[PDB]
Symmetry: C6
């Protein structure tokens, strides 16, 4: 694949994050990315060539396959993985902006050495005191919360879309009724059992990730209330 | 693929750029390159072998396929990606030229230590004061503006070409009328729905990028007016 | 494949581990990962195309194949390898937490230089004395033991599942009785002998790993009793 | 592919070159190498299997294909790319020889510290004064000019060969007359339109490169006359 | 392939070894690994699809192929390569243990500065005097000898197994007698000549390696007697 | 491919070599390795599936193909490349042995500071004076000459074998006479013209390399006579 850039960026962002965020990144790296690339994507290798129908009408097989699978599961999961990673990058960008502000303020104070008072109050407001121990307060906390909410809503929306379109199982026999197939025809899928097992596994993984980020949100809210 | 060199050059150029430029580079890396390489290009894997027509005339299938698809979408998108990346490299080259001029002027001034006056006026004219904080003024701003305009016009031209040639959807049945096929024949495509979905997705991404660079141009014009 | 990330993490974790753990990691890297990727996975390359049955009823071949192989052995082994590696990562995370606590306590004591007494008692309780010679005592030992137990139970559960589903051999002829195949039909597998040999080899490797981790658990219990 | 070594050597040689040479190297890296590897080579993926003729005489298809395509375009372009890169490596070798001579002369002068006069005259003759600012004078200029001429003549020779053999377009229908095909037969190509488009694109790129190196030669001649 | 980890470990272990061991490692890297990966494994690319028999009885081809090839040569050679590399890793582990003991003893002596006498006698017994010039004496020599013997016996056992199973040549025509094939049938192999040539080449390489390690054992025994 | 290790070793050995040796290494890297991997090996991609004969006798096609091609050209060229690279590695090993001797002698002399006389005479005999400027004298020259002779004889032997077996062209039609084909049959090859062109190209490259190493041998003999 080509997941090198996204993996590198996630490795860059995982340095400064909460424990729940680190666990979420770890499970995303292990189960969502590694498992799909290694063995899951090989199952959908001949979902088109092994598909066949019980007719001799030309062109009915392509129409029935297009009717049966509007979009492959592997591509759907890739799109989901892409769409549940942007807000972390947004948080990384905001952290880098905070770092730039810290560097400029440090340069100004080094130049200086009531200005000390305002420099210190600005360094405390952004949570930059130890030169490498950026804390979450004011803006970073807001960005983190909105990122968590966006990730959760994207995941639940994708899950609902998948539930509406396909369901959570693949029957061994599919009934096709569309031109130019005369009347109704019978078509047979390929590897229904493995696909059902992997779909259930991915559903479980998605639910676990949802619960994990919910726990992370609750913990960060409690930490904010602590102050 | 072989996108390593272009990715490395873009990673080199992203160090000194405006926020809008950085966001544009990020979206180009994520959606334009990564998504196409990972899953999109696999859909157009058997657009030739799965294509079939309702006739037994030899050689009609090849002619009808050539009539239907003058150029594959994947190759068109690759060409578009290549053609909407050169001006950034031109800006990078101009920045490197400015760096070379800065190094030579620094060498001359170190040698010296009214010549100081002209050295300082030349260092201010090119915006080279802090030895690593090159600012946009005079020539760099002009190059940046012309690069943005060239990128925008290339993108809109490619979009217009795609609209004229194909459209934005693929019908499940295609009508073919060309020798040696007798009279008219019916041919059936492969995976119309996935291809339509991905075409719409790419169109949305291109429009978003166009809006982003328009916003970047407006912001840089306002910044120039600020002076 | 894409085993780079997991291999890197295991290379990170192997630095601080017992001898039995190092031997287990070595055998996992050599026989479980390298062997499967190099030659074993190529055997299951045409288990679908070479499968054929003695009938001309349309769609019976797909149904019989789905009946015969609920899940491929290669995917099962990949899932097993993934599921017998998490607790080591958990131990690595706990070790990193101990390192963070050590760094914070060192910072506090450097700041100080009865507080010395409590600093020393906390550094001894976590087994952090030589600044890079973390010892197993109290919590690390408990985490190590529970990780070993979890790994063992996961391995035995996977072995039992494989025994119940398939067995440990593949007969050259399979009997299929499922709709729409009329009455009973005969279907012939592909490369039964190589698959049986590799299944037996993997079973032997799994048993060896089980014995090795049992020995490691006994040795660590004896070491704990030594104190 | 395996273009890593040649790319590394070109990256090594681009450090010391004229602006025209750098632009030529950039366009060679972008359009000649990257574009061909990414998408162009995939078009010629089934030029043999999709080729078919209107006959049932055994062995006529292979003979007609061999008659139609003496050598594939992709292989021809690869050979051209290889044959229009050697003189740059020759220039790199000569530069390395100059560097070796500079190092030996520096060692001899460091040992010494009329010999100073001859050391200085030899350091000026080879254009080695600043220890890392090698200038083009005498021999390097001659090597550069002959390298440019060799590159230009190789490119024009390859272009003429391609014009004589194929032309610049591929007709959808080819007429074959060769044993054992009885009388004349009709054979149909695969993807004529994409191949014609890419051939025209490569021709334009080659012409642009020719013009660029002509401009570089004129500029370097003017620079030589400047002295 | 995935031979990166084993190659890295062998590169780590080759630093401290006898000349015969280094030559054996070099020949193993060149002829056993590189040659098999580059060109040898491509020959066994269609040993299943090109195999065909002279009958129309369904399912006889699979049975006859399974009868003819119990296990492919490429997989057998991969298993042999894996099984003739473990003892070197065991020697590497013992060397690392010696290094750990050396580091601990050095730490204790640095702390000290009759204890000097025992420290020196322990440093001489393990052959650790120059801090990086570990010599073979007592235990390392025993481990080296047993590793050489284990490697030799594994190689000869694999050679005997291959001789018993297949032989050293592949006849162009194979006779098959097994159900459901009626009476006897004739089946034809694929590329017999290349496979025979490569089998003979691998046999010669294995014999050369056996002779080389025998010479290494004799030389190390003579060196031990020298003391 | 897997040419990384051999390429790395050749990159290691090219540091200390004569100009002719460096040119030979460069041409070997460019034309022998890069060209074969990039485009040449793709031509022999379907030399088995596209091969067909004018008969309906079962099993005659495999026999005729085995008769026609005892060993593929690509594998022959890979074997040749492997067999014309060992003596350079032998020279590298001898150079490393000389380096080890130099390091030990330097250690002994540093310890010392008539022994100086013998140390200096041994350092001059092996041509080790400047600590990094090893010269060819006595043994290194002999090893270099024998390596050149071995390389030349291996290349000429491989060329003679290829001339005897195949020739230097491939006719479009092959006549096959071997059981079970009745009487004589006609079989047709695949892509004869491209294969002939590439064979002629490889022959020219081999002759050029032979001439280059002959020139290198003559030059080194003249240099030896110079002393
Ligand atoms: C049931 C768990 C409920 C809490 C779950 C909390 C989340 C969880 O499960 O792991 C993350 C957590 C915090 O780790 P983290 O390093 O971020 O935080 C440490 C500590 O918990 C405080 O946050 C700070 O120290 P102190 O206290 O001011 O001296 C300081 O962090 P910060 O403030 O500078 O950033 C650290 O010393 O790790 C723990 O071990 C918590 C202690 C209890 C671990 C044992 C379980 C009670
Ligand atoms: C609605 C936003 C409209 C503006 C969008 C502007 C574009 C946008 O959305 O992000 C980029 C922007 C500029 O970032 P950047 O680092 O380039 O610029 C900072 C700052 O904005 C000034 O440009 C300079 O400081 P000062 O001011 O002279 O002390 C100095 O940059 P420069 O001059 O040395 O290169 C920096 O401190 O980031 C912000 O946070 C803007 C502040 C407002 C952020 C909050 C929103 C108002
Ligand atoms: C039959 C083997 C039964 C034991 C199997 C034990 C497991 C096994 O087979 O290998 C691991 C083992 C321990 O190695 P490791 O480096 O962890 O431990 C060394 C030593 O054994 C003690 O643990 C400590 O030294 P001391 O003793 O306090 O001076 C110190 O470790 P630690 O305490 O600081 O972490 C080390 O010097 O290696 C051996 O050579 C054991 C000695 C006997 C090797 C010869 C066989 C008796
Ligand atoms: C129409 C252009 C015609 C010329 C095209 C020339 C080719 C072209 O388009 O780009 C390359 C060119 C030379 O760049 P390069 O760094 O090699 O050369 C710089 C300069 O031009 C002189 O060559 C030298 O300085 P000076 O002058 O002695 O103080 C010194 O180089 P050198 O001598 O130590 O190696 C450098 O300062 O870049 C320019 O900006 C030229 C100035 C005009 C740029 C603006 C356009 C006039
Ligand atoms: C027919 C060859 C029979 C012997 C084959 C022996 C094996 C073979 O063919 O290559 C390996 C061999 C030993 O190399 P290696 O570096 O291990 O050993 C060198 C030397 O031979 C002694 O072993 C030691 O020096 P000294 O002697 O105490 O001053 C010291 O090694 P060590 O003791 O510190 O580890 C080294 O100086 O290389 C040679 O050149 C041997 C000399 C003769 C080379 C010329 C042929 C006679
Ligand atoms: C027709 C060519 C016939 C000779 C072909 C010779 C082979 C060829 O074509 O390139 C290699 C050659 C030698 O290069 P290399 O760096 O090995 O050798 C240089 C020099 O030639 C002498 O060998 C030594 O210097 P000096 O002389 O003692 O001060 C010293 O090398 P060494 O001794 O310390 O190792 C070096 O300065 O390069 C040349 O430029 C030769 C000079 C003439 C180049 C111009 C052509 C005459």
């Amino acid at each position: 694949g080509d997941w090198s850039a996204l993996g590198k960026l996630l490795d860059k962002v995982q340095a400064y994050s909460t424990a729940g965020g680190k666990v979420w990144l770890s499970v995303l790296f292990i189960f969502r990315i590694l498992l799909l690339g290694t063995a899951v994507e090989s199952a959908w290798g001949d979902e088109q060539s092994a598909f066949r129908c019980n007719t001799q009408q030309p062109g009915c097989e392509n129409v029935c396959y297009d009717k049966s699978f509007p979009i492959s599961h592997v591509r759907f999961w890739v799109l989901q993985i892409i769409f549940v990673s942007v807000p972390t990058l947004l948080y990384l960008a905001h952290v880098f902006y905070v770092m730039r502000k810290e560097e400029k303020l440090n340069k100004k104070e080094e130049e200086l050495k009531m200005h000390l008072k305002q420099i210190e109050i600005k360094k405390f407001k952004y949570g930059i005191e130890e030169h490498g121990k950026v804390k979450m307060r004011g803006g970073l906390l807001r960005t983190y919360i909105i990122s968590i909410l966006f990730k959760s809503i994207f995941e639940v929306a994708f899950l609902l879309i998948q539930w509406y379109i396909y369901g959570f199982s693949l029957s061994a026999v599919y009934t096709c009724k569309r031109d130019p197939c005369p009347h109704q025809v019978d078509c047979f899928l390929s590897r229904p059992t493995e696909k059902t097992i992997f779909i259930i596994f991915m559903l479980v993984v998605s639910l676990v990730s949802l619960a994990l980020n919910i726990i992370e949100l609750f913990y960060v809210f409690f930490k904010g209330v602590k102050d």
